[PDB]
Structure 1
Amino acid sequence: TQSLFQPITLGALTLKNRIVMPPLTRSRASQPGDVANHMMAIYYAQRASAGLIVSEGTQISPTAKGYAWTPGIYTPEQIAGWRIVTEAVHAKGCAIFAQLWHVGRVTHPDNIDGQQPISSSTLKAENVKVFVDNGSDEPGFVDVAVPRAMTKADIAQVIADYRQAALNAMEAGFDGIELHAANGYLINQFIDSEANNRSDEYGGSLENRLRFLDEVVAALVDAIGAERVGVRLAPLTTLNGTVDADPILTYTAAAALLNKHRIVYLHIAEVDWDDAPDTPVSFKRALREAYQGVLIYAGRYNAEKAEQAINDGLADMIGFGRPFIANPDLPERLRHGYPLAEHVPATLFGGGEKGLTDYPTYQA
Structure 2
Amino acid sequence: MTQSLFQPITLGALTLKNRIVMPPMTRSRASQPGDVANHMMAIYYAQRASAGLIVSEGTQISPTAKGYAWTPGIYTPEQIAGWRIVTEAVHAKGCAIFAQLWHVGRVTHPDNIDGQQPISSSTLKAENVKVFVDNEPGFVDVAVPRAMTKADIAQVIADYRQAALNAMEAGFDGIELHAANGYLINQFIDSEANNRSDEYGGSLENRLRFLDEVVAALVDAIGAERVGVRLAPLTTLNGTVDADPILTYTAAAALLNKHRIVYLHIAEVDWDDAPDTPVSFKRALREAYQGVLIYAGRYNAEKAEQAINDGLADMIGFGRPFIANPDLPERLRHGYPLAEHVPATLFGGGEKGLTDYPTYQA
Give the TM-score category using the shorter length: over 0.9
- Could you give the per-residue CA deviations for residues 151-183 of structure 1, whole angstroms, max 9, x where no partner exists? 000000000000000000000000000000000
TM-score calculated relative to the size of structure 1: 0.99
1:72 lines up with 2:73 in the alignment: yes
How far apart, in 2, do the equivalents of 1:164 and 1:270 lie? 29
- Could you give the per-residue CA deviations for residues 197-228 of structure 1, whole angstroms, max 9, x where no partner exists? 00000000000000000000000000000000
- Could you give the per-residue CA deviations for residues 134-167 of structure 1, whole angstroms, max 9, x where no partner exists? 6xxx520001100000000000000000000000
How far apart, in 1, do the equivalents of 2:134 and 2:116 lie? 15
How far apart, in 2, do the equivalents of 1:199 and 1:142 lie? 31
1:95 lines up with 2:77 in the alignment: no
SS at match of 1:57: strand
SS at match of 1:92: coil
TM-score calculated relative to the size of structure 2: 0.99
How far apart, in 1, do the equivalents of 2:348 and 2:137 lie? 11
How far apart, in 2, do the equivalents of 1:252 and 1:34 lie? 36
How far apart, in 1, do the equivalents of 2:112 and 2:237 lie? 19
- Could you give the per-residue CA deviations for residues 286-326 of structure 1, whole angstroms, max 9, x where no partner exists? 00000000000000000000000000000000000000000
1:121 lines up with 2:115 in the alignment: no
1:274 lines up with 2:272 in the alignment: yes
Gaps of 5+ in 2: none
Structure 1 moving runs of 4+ over 6 Å: none
The aligned runs of 1:1-364 (5 Å cut-off) are 1-133=2-134, 139-364=137-362
How far apart, in 2, do the equivalents of 1:126 and 1:273 lie? 17
How far apart, in 2, do the equivalents of 1:169 and 1:114 lie? 27
How far apart, in 2, do the equivalents of 1:250 and 1:50 lie? 31
SS at match of 1:308: helix
How far apart, in 2, do the equivalents of 1:133 and 1:240 lie? 21
Q: Quote how far apart the aligned CAs of 1:246 are.
A: 0.3
Q: Quote how far apart the aligned CAs of 1:239 are.
A: 2.2
Gaps of 5+ in 1: none
SS at match of 1:25: coil
SS at match of 1:142: strand
- Could you give the per-residue CA deviations for residues 55-100 of structure 1, whole angstroms, max 9, x where no partner exists? 0000000000000000000000000000000000000000000000
How far apart, in 1, do the equivalents of 2:89 and 2:173 lie? 13
SS at match of 2:25: coil
SS at match of 1:252: helix
SS at match of 2:252: helix
Q: Quote how far apart the aligned CAs of 1:267 are.
A: 0.1
SS at match of 2:175: strand
SS at match of 1:232: strand
How far apart, in 1, do the equivalents of 2:247 and 2:337 lie? 39
Q: CA RMSD in A?
A: 0.5
